[PDB]
Write a protein that binds this ligand. Structure first.
Ligand SMILES: [Sr+2]
Length: 119
RNA sequence: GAAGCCCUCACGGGCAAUGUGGUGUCAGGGCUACCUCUCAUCAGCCGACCGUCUCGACGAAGUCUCUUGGAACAGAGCGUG
């Protein structure tokens, strides 16, 4: 919330998770706020996901600004266990990063586009 | 970066990406490229001697004479470990 500056429509979110699912099956993705963070710092990230129901908020407060000063696109997901499920985890995930998609690049690209537009 | 842990004989359940587990800890460490090598450390297995404290077994040689005395464990005499 304090780190959320725009609401992502349920639909856009639907597509993103799908792109992430096919991303892990095809391309490469990182699970966990620590791995996600290093990807953004190493620049090996194309699209980063960040849950909104993370408590405490400190765990992910840094993602937004760290991404902007890295050109890396990011998007918000409502639930925390969905991001984890979509990332292929048996638990939750406060953040995720698509480290080079796979057969989803087109979509991942559009999702990012739709985001910049959503300001 | 799930390669992990806990419960249950098992089935199975729970924990764990808000990080279980590997690596590492100033002889700094990690990483990339090499040399060599390990007996350091850490984990686990086995597992005492001796010493000390207490407890217990075994364990030598007179119950001889006289006198006194209620009693010899006394005095004098002879004998023993
Ligand atoms: Sr959870």
């Amino acid at each position: 919330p304090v780190y959320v500056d725009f609401d992502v429509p349920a639909d856009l979110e639907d597509d993103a998770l799908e792109a992430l699912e096919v991303a892990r099956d095809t391309g490469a993705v990182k699970k966990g706020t620590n791995e996600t963070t290093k990807s953004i710092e190493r620049g090996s990230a194309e699209l980063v996901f960040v849950a909104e129901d993370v408590q405490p908020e400190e765990i992910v407060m840094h993602i937004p600004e760290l991404a902007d000063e890295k050109g890396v696109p990011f998007i918000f997901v409502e639930q925390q266990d969905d991001l984890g499920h979509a990332a292929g985890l048996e638990v939750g995930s406060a953040a995720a990063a698509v480290t080079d998609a796979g057969e989803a690049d087109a979509d991942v690209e559009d999702i990012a586009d739709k985001v910049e537009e959503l300001r």
